[PDB]
Design an enzyme around this catalytic site. Structure first.
Site, PDB file in Angstrom:
ATOM      1  CG  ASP A  36       5.089  22.647 -40.266  1.00  0.00           C
ATOM      2  OD1 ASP A  36       4.212  22.196 -40.483  1.00  0.00           O
ATOM      3  OD2 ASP A  36       5.854  23.261 -39.534  1.00  0.00           O
ATOM      4  CG  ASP A 232       0.712  21.433 -41.106  1.00  0.00           C
ATOM      5  OD1 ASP A 232       1.767  20.680 -40.958  1.00  0.00           O
ATOM      6  OD2 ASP A 232       0.209  21.882 -39.582  1.00  0.00           O
TER       7      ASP A 232
HETATM    8  C1  LIG Z   1       0.369  30.932 -36.436  1.00  0.00           C
HETATM    9  C2  LIG Z   1       1.672  30.303 -36.506  1.00  0.00           C
HETATM   10  O1  LIG Z   1       2.346  30.717 -37.721  1.00  0.00           O
HETATM   11  C3  LIG Z   1       3.632  29.812 -37.470  1.00  0.00           C
HETATM   12  N1  LIG Z   1       3.296  28.345 -36.638  1.00  0.00           N
HETATM   13  C4  LIG Z   1       4.649  27.652 -37.016  1.00  0.00           C
HETATM   14  N2  LIG Z   1       4.235  26.649 -36.351  1.00  0.00           N
HETATM   15  C5  LIG Z   1       3.061  26.463 -35.562  1.00  0.00           C
HETATM   16  C6  LIG Z   1       3.307  23.970 -35.252  1.00  0.00           C
HETATM   17  C7  LIG Z   1       2.366  23.570 -35.491  1.00  0.00           C
HETATM   18  O2  LIG Z   1       1.601  23.928 -34.547  1.00  0.00           O
HETATM   19  N3  LIG Z   1       2.414  23.667 -36.188  1.00  0.00           N
HETATM   20  C8  LIG Z   1       0.702  22.418 -36.906  1.00  0.00           C
HETATM   21  C9  LIG Z   1       2.776  22.894 -37.378  1.00  0.00           C
HETATM   22  N4  LIG Z   1       2.247  22.699 -38.178  1.00  0.00           N
HETATM   23  N5  LIG Z   1       3.967  23.308 -37.469  1.00  0.00           N
HETATM   24  C10 LIG Z   1       4.751  24.114 -35.895  1.00  0.00           C
HETATM   25  C11 LIG Z   1       4.923  23.352 -35.251  1.00  0.00           C
HETATM   26  C12 LIG Z   1       5.432  22.430 -33.876  1.00  0.00           C
HETATM   27  C13 LIG Z   1       6.044  22.147 -33.752  1.00  0.00           C
HETATM   28  C14 LIG Z   1       5.946  21.121 -34.647  1.00  0.00           C
HETATM   29  C15 LIG Z   1       5.999  19.327 -34.115  1.00  0.00           C
HETATM   30  N6  LIG Z   1       6.096  18.397 -34.134  1.00  0.00           N
HETATM   31  S1  LIG Z   1       5.132  21.226 -35.972  1.00  0.00           S
HETATM   32  C16 LIG Z   1       4.973  25.674 -36.196  1.00  0.00           C
HETATM   33  N7  LIG Z   1       5.394  28.969 -36.812  1.00  0.00           N
HETATM   34  C17 LIG Z   1       5.591  29.496 -37.707  1.00  0.00           C
HETATM   35  C18 LIG Z   1       7.038  30.335 -37.512  1.00  0.00           C
HETATM   36  C19 LIG Z   1       4.753  30.402 -37.613  1.00  0.00           C
HETATM   37  F1  LIG Z   1       4.509  32.014 -38.155  1.00  0.00           F
END
Ligand SMILES: CCOc1nc(N2C[C@H]3C(=O)N(C)C(=N)N[C@@]3(c3ccc(C#N)s3)C2)nc(C)c1F
Length: 387
Positions: A36, A232
């Site tokens: 990620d 991303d």
């Molecule tokens: C603002 C929130 O900040 C943070 N955001 C996050 N994430 C937001 C999620 C998301 O929505 N996108 C798009 C992403 N790229 N990553 C996450 C995914 C979850 C499940 C996925 C699959 N398949 S990908 C992890 N983790 C931490 C630890 C934060 F602090």
């Protein structure tokens, strides 16, 4: 150069994410970990969950260290809670090193673990600024570079199959490569073109022009980066700011107007199907995003095909797809369906992101994805959003 030990170390697909095998603890506990570039925590399932067939068992690791601190991560579509600690971590099909890294042991979650995704944790590769609970929790890649001689760079080749893969096929198929500490020249064709990383938090970039089949969308370039543009791997779609999405969809509809699609298709909700082998790729336009170059007043473009932005889904023997371009209220997101067209170099050492045509992009005999330049572009700093 050539990093044969890391080539083909990913599995997965754009909708469920691409993952790499990792080990945590002593003796090593193997887990599949989502790659990620949109987050900065290394977090793993550490308690039973209906959708996990394995999880990190801290009591079985002799090298586990408890940080005595919790972490609560609520985001838009999901949430997780955990306990911070450190342990020894390795990437079996990676650099031959073991590092002591922070690990958030997930104890409670909501809509986080995807049924049938085959991954049990997430490897956040972005910068400390967006790490939870705060920027003092050193991200994995920062620890890896600090503790070893691994160069401060990684590159990703995400490989879309171009057709649906069933449960057994997705476990047996190669989903791509994550080259840690280098660039593997076998993964791309043509030249690499670099865009500056605007700021080190997300992998933030600046889009300076957008074309649909060569036709300029003609919006003020600030609109394309409102309120940011990021790269991303954890997002499936190409996500565009509301007004940009509205203008792009109108243009894509006009270019593909020889066939009418229901509103649900354009909303990314409903699949569209064609008789086996008859998908009319040629009626759909190519999409070019121009990115700020490294040279003053210079830009380059990346061009994707409908084979990237129409995501294959199972229905029958028909070939079915979902439209993988969607609206955002949090800026542009160049997700997996953009990344599947290109080999992407996250050159942290030189604060730049490189793009080249991927050796595994899906195309037809008439058109290919492209990375071309240079173009003369003025006032590109004006394209970036502030406040
Ligand atoms: C603002 C929130 O900040 C943070 N955001 C996050 N994430 C937001 C999620 C998301 O929505 N996108 C798009 C992403 N790229 N990553 C996450 C995914 C979850 C499940 C996925 C699959 N398949 S990908 C992890 N983790 C931490 C630890 C934060 F602090």
């Amino acid at each position: 150069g050539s990093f044969v030990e890391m080539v083909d170390n990913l599995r997965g697909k754009s909708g469920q994410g691409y993952y790499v095998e990792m080990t945590v603890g002593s003796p090593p506990q193997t887990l599949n970990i989502l790659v990620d570039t949109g987050s900065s925590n290394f977090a793993v399932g550490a308690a039973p969950h209906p959708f996990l067939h394995r999880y990190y068992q801290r009591q079985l690791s002799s090298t586990y260290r408890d940080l005595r601190k919790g972490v609560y991560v609520p985001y838009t579509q999901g949430k997780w809670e955990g306990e911070l600690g450190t342990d020894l971590v390795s990437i079996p099909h990676g650099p031959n090193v073991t590092v002591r890294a922070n690990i958030a042991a997930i104890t409670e979650s909501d809509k986080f673990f995807i049924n049938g995704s085959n991954w049990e944790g997430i490897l956040g590769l972005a910068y400390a600024e967006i790490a939870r609970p705060d920027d003092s929790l050193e991200p994995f890649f920062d620890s890896l570079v600090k503790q070893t001689h691994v160069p401060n760079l990684f590159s990703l080749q995400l490989c879309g199959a171009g057709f649906p893969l069933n449960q057994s096929e997705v476990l047996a198929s190669v989903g791509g490569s994550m080259i840690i500490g280098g660039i593997d020249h076998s993964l791309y064709t043509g030249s690499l073109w670099y865009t500056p990383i605007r700021r080190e938090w997300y992998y933030e970039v600046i889009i300076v022009r957008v074309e649909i089949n060569g036709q300029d969308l003609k919006m003020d370039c600030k609109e394309y980066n409102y309120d940011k543009s990021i790269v991303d791997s954890g997002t499936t779609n190409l996500r565009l700011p509301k007004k940009v999405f509205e203008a792009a969809v109108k243009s894509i509809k006009a270019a593909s107007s020889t066939e009418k699609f229901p509103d649900g298709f354009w909303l990314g909700e409903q699949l569209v199907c064609w008789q086996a082998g008859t998908t009319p790729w040629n009626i759909f336009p190519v999409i070019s995003l121009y990115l700020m170059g490294e040279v003053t007043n210079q830009s380059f473009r990346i061009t994707i095909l409908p084979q990237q932005y129409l995501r294959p889904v199972e229905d029958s023997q028909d070939d079915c797809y979902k439209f993988a371009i969607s609206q955002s209220s949090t800026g542009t997101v160049m997700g997996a369906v953009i990344m599947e067209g290109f080999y992407v170099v996250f050159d942290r050492a030189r604060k730049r992101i490189g793009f080249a045509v991927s050796a595994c992009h899906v195309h037809d005999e008439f058109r290919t994805a492209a990375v071309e330049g240079p173009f003369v572009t003025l006032d590109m700093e004006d394209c970036g959003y502030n406040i």
